[PDB]
């Protein structure tokens, strides 16, 4: 087991990582900005290092400062959490070059999945179903681009190969708009990644966002831990996630899961990872892979019993997977509601001091948050201040528990999205299940 690690993150995920470290007897180093001195995990950590001022560029994205903190404390590994530098291949490379373990895959693997075109090519080769597409970057030959579009069939979508999460894409519905659409996507990509590479996919009109959790030890062992539906979202931000995905049969799960696991072996994947799919008309289509642990990991933990963070730490210590595929069993159902400090009318972050706090408790209730009474939510970071996760023996039980936990939750002094979460739990279409990626924005437009 790793002697000591730097937790290269903040907020709820840093606390989540700290708890796993403590379970495993791993010493903790909490690196933090000057605005984050009173973070719960910082107060709980074995050692603390202030790595810079409030803005993320000079703290949580400050590669030399994070590496120096590992150096000064004699840490053996760095956990990047999610966001920040977790998908930064240069950071992973610098971490290993400086002589520390990066808790994540090889830098080459991060780089491979970071490039959307190369990622899809690798996944297609491995037998993972992808969206019908260009299978390569689009060039300047518009005859060739029209032929790709015809072969695929309109509508199509132009996507940037550098891009993440849905940044800068456009739907094309005929030849008439194709040339300009390619042109425009190229330009926005140049500003975002200094990379004008674009590709084409068949545009799916009303898909669900379904992602497969994997773990791989780098020793040839790779398992899939069912799936999560993340379709409930607003402006590229997930709002509610759940596991398993409604309507997914054991057979479909096994079909897609085995293909993801085999792909992990093909690419020499190491650690936790997520294969993101679009799901429409009973069919899976790979869009991208996340090579980090994700915000929504807890729903997968509830339905499988596998502690994904502890697995990351075990794998980073060079241990083989703690379980075989045949030992992974989907049981019950879990729903996560993200709790955001945000104004309900503007959807802008709403920072400030929490004056009264009470966490929900009870059977099947899991509360993931650094917040406490008297804690000030700083203006400098993301709006998500906690995650409420409810498990039950079935989806209806999980939802009923979530409704009650949400009503029990008290966060006074700041504005939150609790009332919206309650609305969603009471939504008849959500109660039925299987709503698509466009649903919440359509609902909120009414
Ligand atoms: C990365 C990505 N690809 C798509 C997409 C949608 C329809 N067809 C195709 N091919 N891709 C959508 N997104 C981003 C996204 C996702 Cl993945 C989930 C909800 C909303 C949004 Cl805008
Ligand atoms: Cl994430």
Q: Which ligand is located closest to the Cα atom of residue 82?
A: 2
Approach to solving: X-ray
DSSP-derived 3-state class of residue 65: helix
What spacing in Å lies between the alpha carbon of 296 and ligand 2's midpoint? 7
DSSP-derived 3-state class of residue 106: coil
Contact 116, 162 (CB under 8 A): yes
DSSP-derived 3-state class of residue 68: helix
Ligand 1 pocket test, pick from 437, 438, 441, 442 with the greatest ligand atom count within 8 Å of Cβ, gives 437
Q: Which ligand is located closest to the Cα atom of residue 387?
A: 2
**Nearest-CA neighbor of 355 among 415, 443, 287?**
415
Residue list for the binding site for biotin: 338
Sign of CA dihedral 418, 423, 426, 427: negative
The answer for residues whose C-beta is within 8 angstroms of residue 159's C-beta and 6 or more apart is 116, 169, 185, 198, 199, 200, 201
Ligand 1 pocket test, pick from 237, 278, 290 with the greatest ligand atom count within 8 Å of Cβ, gives 278
Residue list for the binding site for ATP: 116, 159, 165-166, 201-204, 209, 236, 276, 288
Q: Whose CA is nearest to atom 7 of ligand 1?
A: 204
What spacing in Å lies between the alpha carbon of 443 and ligand 1's midpoint? 18
- Specify the pairing of strand 156-160 against strand 101-102: unpaired
What spacing in Å lies between the alpha carbon of 383 and ligand 2's midpoint? 14
Q: Is the CB of 155 under 6 A from ligand 1?
A: no
**Adjacent-strand bridge partners of 48:** 30
Residue list for the binding site: 116, 159, 165-166, 201-204, 209, 236, 238, 276, 288, 290, 292, 295, 338
Q: Is the CB of 287 under 6 A from ligand 1?
A: yes
Q: At what angle do helices 11-23 and 308-316 cross, to 10 degrees?
A: 60
- How far is 385 from 398, CA to CA, in rounded Å? 22
Q: Chain centroid to CA 51: how far? A: 25
Q: Which domains does the chain have, with CATH numbers?
A: 1-85 (3.40.50.20), 86-130+204-444 (3.30.470.20), 131-203 (3.30.1490.20)
Q: Is the CB of 289 under 6 A from ligand 1?
A: no
Helix/strand/coil percent split, the chain, to 5:
35, 25, 35
What spacing in Å lies between the alpha carbon of 293 and ligand 2's midpoint? 7
Report in angstroms the alpha-carbon separations of 120 from 26, 42, 134, 331. Answer: 37, 39, 10, 31
What spacing in Å lies between the alpha carbon of 205 and ligand 1's midpoint? 10
Task: Say if residue 72 is exposed, middle or buried (CB neighbours under 10 Å; 0-12, 13-18, 19+).
Answer: exposed
Residue for token pair 């079935």: 394
- How far is 272 from 292, CA to CA, in rounded Å? 6
Residue list for the binding site for hydrogencarbonate: 238, 292, 295, 338
Q: Is the CB of 163 under 6 A from ligand 1?
A: no
- C-alpha dihedral, 268 to 107 to 11 to 65, nearest 10°: 150
Q: Which atom of ligand 1 is nearest to the CA of 233?
A: 19
What are the backbone angles phi and psi of residue 237, rounded to the nearest 5°?
-110, 120
The answer for residues whose C-beta is within 8 angstroms of residue 439's C-beta and 6 or more apart is 231, 232, 429, 430
Confirm whether 151 is a catalytic residue: no
Burial pattern 423-440, b for ≥16 Cβ within 10 A else e, equals: ebbebeebeeeebbbebb
Q: Which ligand is located closest to the Cα atom of residue 237?
A: 1
Neighbours of ion ligand 2 (CB under 5 A): 82, 294-295
**Nearest-CA neighbor of 413 among 363, 336, 355?**
355
Quick one: residue 288, left, alpha or beta (phi over 0 = left, psi -120 to 50 = alpha)? beta
Q: Which atom of ligand 1 is nearest to the CA of 131?
A: 10
Q: Chain centroid to CA 35: how far? A: 25
Catalytic residue among 186, 259, 292, 366: 292
Quick one: residue 67, left, alpha or beta (phi over 0 = left, psi -120 to 50 = alpha)? alpha
Q: Is the CB of 236 under 6 A from ligand 1?
A: yes
Per-position DSSP letters for 364-384, written without gaps between them: TEEEEE---TT-EE-TTS-SE
Q: Whose CA is nearest to atom 22 of ligand 1?
A: 166
What spacing in Å lies between the alpha carbon of 294 and ligand 2's midpoint? 4
Contact 244, 213 (CB under 8 A): no
What spacing in Å lies between the alpha carbon of 97 and ligand 1's midpoint? 35
Q: Chain centroid to CA 159: how far? A: 20
Tokens (6 digits) for 317: 């210590």
What are the backbone angles phi and psi of residue 395, rounded to the nearest 5°?
-60, -45
């Amino acid at each position: 087991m790793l002697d000591k690690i730097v937790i290269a993150n903040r907020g709820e995920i840093a606390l989540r990582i700290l708890r796993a470290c403590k379970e495993l007897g791993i010493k903790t180093v909490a690196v933090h900005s000057s605005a984050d001195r009173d973070l719960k995990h910082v107060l709980l950590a074995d050692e603390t290092v202030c790595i810079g001022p409030a803005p993320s560029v000079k703290s949580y994205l400050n590669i030399p400062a994070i590496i120096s903190a590992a150096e000064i404390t004699g840490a053996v590994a760095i956990h990047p959490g999610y966001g920040f530098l977790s998908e930064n291949a240069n950071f992973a490379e610098q971490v290993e070059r400086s002589g520390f373990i990066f808790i994540g895959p090889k830098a080459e693997t991060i780089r491979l999945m970071g490039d959307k075109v190369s990622a899809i090519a690798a996944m297609k080769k491995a037998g993972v179903p992808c969206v019908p597409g260009s299978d390569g970057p689009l060039g300047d030959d518009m005859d060739k681009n029209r032929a790709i579009a015809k072969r695929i069939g309109y509508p199509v979508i132009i996507k940037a190969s550098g891009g993440g999460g849905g940044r800068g894409m456009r739907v094309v519905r005929g030849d008439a708009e194709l040339a300009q659409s390619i042109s425009m996507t190229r330009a926005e990509a140049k500003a975002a990644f200094s990379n004008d590479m674009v590709y084409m996919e068949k545009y799916l009109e009303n898909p669900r966002h379904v992602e497969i959790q994997v773990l791989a030890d780098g020793q040839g062992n790779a398992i899939y831990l069912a799936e999560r539906d993340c379709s409930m979202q607003r402006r590229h931000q997930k709002v509610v996630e759940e596991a398993p995905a409604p309507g997914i049969t054991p057979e479909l799960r096994r079909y897609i899961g085995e293909r993801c696991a085999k792909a992990c072996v093909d690419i020499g994947y190491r650690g936790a990872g997520t294969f993101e799919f679009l799901f429409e008309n009973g069919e899976f289509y790979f869009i991208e892979m996340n090579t980090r642990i994700q915000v929504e990991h807890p729903v997968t933990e509830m339905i499988t019993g596998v502690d994904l963070i502890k697995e990351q730490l075990r794998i980073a210590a060079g241990q083989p997977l703690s379980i075989k595929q045949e030992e992974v069993h989907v049981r019950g159902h879990a729903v996560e509601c993200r709790i955001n400090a945000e104004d309900p009318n503007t959807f802008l972050p709403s920072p400030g001091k929490i004056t009264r706090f009470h966490a929900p408790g009870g059977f099947g209730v899991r509360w993931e948050s650094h917040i406490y009474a008297g804690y000030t939510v700083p203006p400098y970071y993301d709006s998500m201040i906690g995650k409420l996760i409810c498990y039950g023996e079935n989806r209806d039980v999980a939802i009923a528990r979530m409704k009650n936990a949400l009503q029990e939750l008290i966060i006074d002094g700041i504005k939150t999205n609790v009332d919206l979460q309650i609305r969603i739990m009471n939504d008849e279409n959500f109660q039925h299940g299987g709503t698509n990626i466009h649903y919440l924005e359509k609902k909120l437009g009414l």
